[PDB]
Design a protein around this ligand. Sequence first.
Ligand SMILES: [Cl-]
Ligand SMILES: [Mg+2]
Ligand SMILES: [Mg+2]
Length: 375
Amino acid sequence: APLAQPELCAVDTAPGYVAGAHQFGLSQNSHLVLPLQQSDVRKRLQVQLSIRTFASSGLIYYVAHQNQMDYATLQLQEGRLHFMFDLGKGRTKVSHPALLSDGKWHTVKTEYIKRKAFMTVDGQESPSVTVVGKATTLDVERKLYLGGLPSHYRARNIGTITHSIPACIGEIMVNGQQLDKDRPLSASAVDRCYVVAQEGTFFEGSGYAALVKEGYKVRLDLQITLEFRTTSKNGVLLGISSAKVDAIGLEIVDGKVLFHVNNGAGRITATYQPRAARALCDGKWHTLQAHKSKHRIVLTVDGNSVRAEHSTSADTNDPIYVGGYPAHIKQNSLSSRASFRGCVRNLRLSQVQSLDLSRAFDLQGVFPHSCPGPE
Ligand SMILES: [Cl-]
Ligand SMILES: [Mg+2]
Ligand SMILES: [Mg+2]
């Protein structure tokens, strides 16, 4: 029974979904395996597709011989496109300057024809490159992998960018023919695209994402930074806990942000309370910094800091739970059990390390890299 009428939070407007489009990158192996029947790519491979993304890296498409001696692939790296193939006796590579990670739709074309190869993005064609090697044919299996690769597949000689691209892909054509993406040979972890999206990972409020199955050790010093947006007053953000006492936690309870830490001598808590109760559930992005050092704990929200200052090591050796946690998992430094609802972006631990939610080993009600609504 509150003394004043409750302060309502902002409201989220569902954008709906794009018809005939697929969102990849939800897991490191999200993909579609599409049949190639009428295409003869031996002397010519022209692929045209539309893409929308905020990501910096990922595999967009791949085709290869059973022995992998012949192949062709399109990958994104540092926000830019790279097209390469090997006809059996040498690799040819083409790059394009266009920056694609702006969240807007782009048309892309990759072309290998005769003894030349080139790329086109939004109509801007790159200079041609001469096919390398003596071989004259691209000999590959009658199958194209779109948006990523199967978990059991081991792609050779295409570098380390073999994870699924966090992006929405529309229709795709090969040598003038539109492929029926609705009739894939097989697939894994694919979903729909929001009509309008913004950079981030959506948490529907029902589950969580668990990372680092081998265990993470907080120890003495650790810096956690992230950005979040939400229209709810309660929600767990992050927790790393031993099955005993040592643990750390970050959560939103009744409009306030709490950073708990326990080095084996009791819970230490830094609390941030905004001027307005509904300030943080306004649907806009907020920055969050939580630094743990020897005998110091500092929580900073939107530039506002709050700290608290005899064991000093948080001896954890467990997974990192994001956005919530299941009942059978102990979280000694979290008072709440409520799953977060909203989006989180730029999650990093510091010597910096950013956490990629698409790598979660256990995921429930969370959609990495896919966040609805405009920014
Ligand atoms: Cl100790
Ligand atoms: Mg060949
Ligand atoms: Mg200890």
